[PDB]
Amino acid sequence: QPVITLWSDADFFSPYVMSVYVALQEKSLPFTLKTVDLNRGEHLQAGWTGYAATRRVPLLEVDDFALSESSAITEYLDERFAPPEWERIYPHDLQKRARARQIQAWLRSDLMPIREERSTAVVFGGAKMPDLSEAGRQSAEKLFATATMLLAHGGQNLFGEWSIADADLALMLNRLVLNGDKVPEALADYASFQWQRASIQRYVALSA
Amino acid sequence: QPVITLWSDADFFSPYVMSVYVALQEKSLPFTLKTVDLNRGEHLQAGWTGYAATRRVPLLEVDDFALSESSAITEYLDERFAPPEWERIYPHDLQKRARARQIQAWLRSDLMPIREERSTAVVFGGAKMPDLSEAGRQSAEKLFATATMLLAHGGQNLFGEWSIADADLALMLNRLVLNGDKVPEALADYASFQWQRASIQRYVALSA
Numbered sequence: 001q002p003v004i005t006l007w008s009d010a011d012f013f014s015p016y017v018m019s020v021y022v023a024l025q026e027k028s029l030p031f032t033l034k035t036v037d038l039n040r041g042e043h044l045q046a047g048w049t050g051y052a053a054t055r056r057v058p059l060l061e062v063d064d065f066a067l068s069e070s071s072a073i074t075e076y077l078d079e080r081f082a083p084p085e086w087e088r089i090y091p092h093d094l095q096k097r098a099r100a101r102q103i104q105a106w107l108r109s110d111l112m113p114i115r116e117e118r119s120t121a122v123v124f125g126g127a128k129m130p131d132l133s134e135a136g137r138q139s140a141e142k143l144f145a146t147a148t149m150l151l152a153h154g155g156q157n158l159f160g161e162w163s164i165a166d167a168d169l170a171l172m173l174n175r176l177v178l179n180g181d182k183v184p185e186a187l188a189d190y191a192s193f194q195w196q197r198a199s200i201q202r203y204v205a206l207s208a
Numbered sequence: 209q210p211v212i213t214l215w216s217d218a219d220f221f222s223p224y225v226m227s228v229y230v231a232l233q234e235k236s237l238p239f240t241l242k243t244v245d246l247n248r249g250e251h252l253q254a255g256w257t258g259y260a261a262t263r264r265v266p267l268l269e270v271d272d273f274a275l276s277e278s279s280a281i282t283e284y285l286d287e288r289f290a291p292p293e294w295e296r297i298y299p300h301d302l303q304k305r306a307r308a309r310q311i312q313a314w315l316r317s318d319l320m321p322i323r324e325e326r327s328t329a330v331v332f333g334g335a336k337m338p339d340l341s342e343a344g345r346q347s348a349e350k351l352f353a354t355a356t357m358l359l360a361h362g363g364q365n366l367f368g369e370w371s372i373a374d375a376d377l378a379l380m381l382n383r384l385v386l387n388g389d390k391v392p393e394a395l396a397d398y399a400s401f402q403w404q405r406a407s408i409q410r411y412v413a414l415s416a
């Protein structure tokens with residue numbers, strides 16, 4: 001049994017920490033949760049292991065191996081703790097897996113106005129934010145249109161069975177849904193359904 | 209033989225298009241190169257296949273499958289056109305592969321001041337940019353420190369044999385090197401060595 005440690009921000013607000021946390025829970029992997037206070041710059045001092053990685057959370061330690069970047073981490077988890085012995089968190093189908101990777105990489109590198117104007121303080125901290133800027137509206141429209149195309153098959157999950165991409169997409173949608181913003185009904189249904197995920201709800205409880 | 213199409217920005221300046229182009233070349237996969245003019249918004253009209261993906265380049269088509277996000281694309285290529293028949297572009301070792309993914313995901317989601325103040329017009333277009341802002345200096349220092357740790361083994365490539373992460377890291381470093389900025393000598397040596405890669409030089413020739 002490897003010793004697994006997950007490093008979180010001190011508020012448990014990070015969507016990227018959430019992604020890793022969810023992956024661990026879905027595989028029933030035992031782990032220790034530790035924190036760094038980003039607001040006080042605990043990440044920008046060399047006392048924590050993550051200063052030597054990318055100086056960001058999440059960081060996952062598995063025995064003597066330390067790895068940053070949530071998607072790198074979850075991909076590693078799915079390879080190291082592989083099906084059938086552990087539950088798979090990426091689609092088995094080549095193309096669906098590629099689409100899952102597309103979604104993850106897209107969410108991490110686009111939609112900055114939503115990430116800034118609808119931070120995870122809305123999602124995990126009960127914060128309420130003012131109307132979106134026009135830049136925010138543009139990002140919202142792209143999000144909506146993209147999610148609608150991905151979910152056009154009418155299924156509950158992106159790729160049939162639940163995958164880690166569902167958690168990440170649901171979080172992004174919930175930045176808007178949980179702020180009380182106007183969201184297409186089918187997308188609000190998806191986001192609220194996915195947010196009930198036991199693994200997600202366990203993470204939600206951390207910042208309660 | 210699948211029909212492969214790569215969509216680029218019209219200038220061939222995208223670092224993400226470069227990553228895919230390089231992957232294709234390294235595997236000796238035949239493909240057609242097409243362009244959309246981002247400056248004129250050709251990506252924000254529904255006449256191109258990529259409006260229905262994430263409305264960004266690169267987009268790769270492989271017969272009837274269309275996929276965006278450079279790292280999703282290169283990961284797909286390494287699975288669909290797998291070693292030994294085709295050259296591998298990700299490390300075979302589990303941990304080195306995870307580190308390669310970390311680097312790719314990190315470069316795509318951090319260092320925004322470098323990406324903005326040292327755009328790929330410097331890299332591919334002969335542009336020269338003024339002194340970095342303090343925010344730019346902060347990003348440069350993080351880049352330097354991180355690359356130095358990754359390359360501390362003293363080898364020519366990140367993970368022994370060349371991997372796609374070398375191309376992406378070299379490009380990021382070359383945003384600074386090719387602008388005439390002060391860069392630690394060992395990192396400038398790495399960046400210039402990697403930039404000689406035949407696949408990279410072929411892409412460089414496109415915007416000549």
Ligand SMILES: N[C@@H](CCC(=O)N[C@@H](CS)C(=O)NCC(=O)O)C(=O)O
Pocket residue numbers: 009014015016038043055056057058068069070071108313314317
């Ligand atoms: N692409 C990343 C992003 C990680 C990230 O942005 N983490 C933030 C907290 S949510 C952070 O550590 N920021 C501190 C900093 O950039 O100095 C991932 O998926 O892990």
Ligand SMILES: N[C@@H](CCC(=O)N[C@@H](CS)C(=O)NCC(=O)O)C(=O)O
Pocket residue numbers: 105106109217222223224246251263264265266276277278279316
């Ligand atoms: N994470 C992406 C980023 C892709 C990206 O930012 N592409 C830019 C050109 S370099 C783009 O298409 N921008 C158009 C837009 O955002 O509307 C990747 O690796 O493919």
Ligand SMILES: [Cl-]
Pocket residue numbers: 009010011036037038039
């Ligand atoms: Cl914090």
Ligand SMILES: [Cl-]
Pocket residue numbers: 217218219244245246247
């Ligand atoms: Cl263009």
